[PDB]
């Protein structure tokens with residue numbers, strides 16, 4: 001499931017902004 | 021339809037916004053400055069860290085009021101080439117006034133650091149509640165989404181672009197209402213701007229494609245947010261930013277089967293690559309959003325007035341994360357004096 005793919009991904013925690 | 025229409029309720033909006041702009045401009049042109057000092061604050065604990073330093077829970081000794089104090093090491097801001105963004109952040113944040121925006125209560129600086137004393141929200145940020153619960157029901161997500169729509173109506177009328185909408189940046193207060201916290205990429209600009217900044221999952225395609233962009237990027241980000249709140253995951257995710265960007269610029273979005281048909285129609289008009297067709301960027305501006313079907317049950321004035329019953333109220337008592345705590349060291353020499361003189 002897409003939810004299972006998300007939960008298993010490396011981007012489930014707080015995401016940092018880029019400014020390069 | 022109802023969106024391409026005046027005048028009685030649209031005129032009240034106009035009047036509110038004109039008065040708000042007058043208020044804002046006085047503060048924009050004469051910013052509050054050096055309004056506290058570090059020793060007025062009892063540092064209780066670290067709440068989180070950003071790239072420039074810690075955010076501490078503090079207590080103002082003379083009022084016993086609690087705040088979150090964002091500390092910015094001036095030297096790290098310079099190395100990261102974020103001087104002008106930092107100056108924007110503070111100049112804008114002290115100047116705005118809206119129920120759903122975190123107040124900049126005091127600011128000051130010393131030899132080493134910049135200090136931003138912000139309104140404390142006892143509920144913490146939405147990100148945490150969202151990840152824990154999994155996803156929000158449509159009415160729940162609609163409630164928060166409505167507050168962002170009004171906040172964007174307010175900020176945009178002032179020529180501000182926000183540029184960092186995401187659950188991480190939205191605080192839940194004691195009434196269960198939202199406060200937008202982080203003004204790090206906020207900018208005042210009439211017309212177009214070019215800085216590649218924001219958070220990968222939330223970037224409009226015109227940002228990724230170095231096209232030069234305006235406030236319509238905020239509207240796209242609202243699209244990502246609504247989707248994230250209701251799905252429990254972002255409409256474009258992957259393990260690496262570059263994989264995310266290809267998904268954003270491809271022009272394709274799959275919706276979960278539980279999304280109502282109204283929700284999907286709203287999101288298709290928000291997550292639109294074509295600026296010519298993106299809701300919020302058309303002749304009717306924000307009204308295309310406000311009079312959309314998905315929002316038909318939303319009483320906007322009641323939202324603004326905080327009359328609507330919040331779906332979730334934060335437990336108040338332990339629950340805090342533990343960080344290693346260390347004393348603030350203030351250098352005996354002034355760093356980066358010139359660069360931050362206006363702070």
Ligand SMILES: Cc1cc(Nc2cc(N3CCN(C)CC3)nc(Sc3ccc(NC(=O)C4CC4)cc3)n2)[nH]n1
Nearest residue numbers: 067068075088138139140141142143144145201202339
């Ligand atoms: C600014 C602010 C932060 C707060 N409140 C809180 C509260 C909190 N809590 C931890 C979890 N319990 C369940 C609730 C209290 N955790 C954080 S963790 C945190 C720390 C900083 C930021 N954001 C910023 O500092 C933005 C302005 C740059 C967001 C969350 N922040 N009120 N006001």
